[PDB]
Design a protein around this ligand. Structure first.
Ligand SMILES: [Zn+2]
Lengths: 36, 46
């Protein structure tokens, strides 16, 4: 789900109405079980 | 007496200046409005 990876803070669980005001991006992470 | 900035949720009068961070006395939510003026505003009734 929505996250905000900013330097000077962990990863704040983001919400619509904020990204709006702060001009951000309502997007979340993508991970893949890669094989070696 | 006196107030500088407020928080988008927990409306608690803050007050800061450069480098003192841009957060709140608790809620991380880094928003903050700049509370009303002291000089009264005058209106017309039409
Ligand atoms: Zn706060």
């Amino acid at each position: 789900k929505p996250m905000v990876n900013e330097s000077d803070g962990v990863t704040h669980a983001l919400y619509p109405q904020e990204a709006r005001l702060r001009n951000l991006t309502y997007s979340s992470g993508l991970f893949v079980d890669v094989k070696k | 007496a006196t107030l500088k900035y407020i928080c988008a949720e927990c409306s608690s009068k803050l007050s800061l200046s450069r480098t003192d961070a841009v957060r709140c006395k608790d809620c991380g939510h880094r928003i903050l409005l700049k509370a009303r003026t002291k000089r009264l505003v005058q209106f017309e009734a039409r």
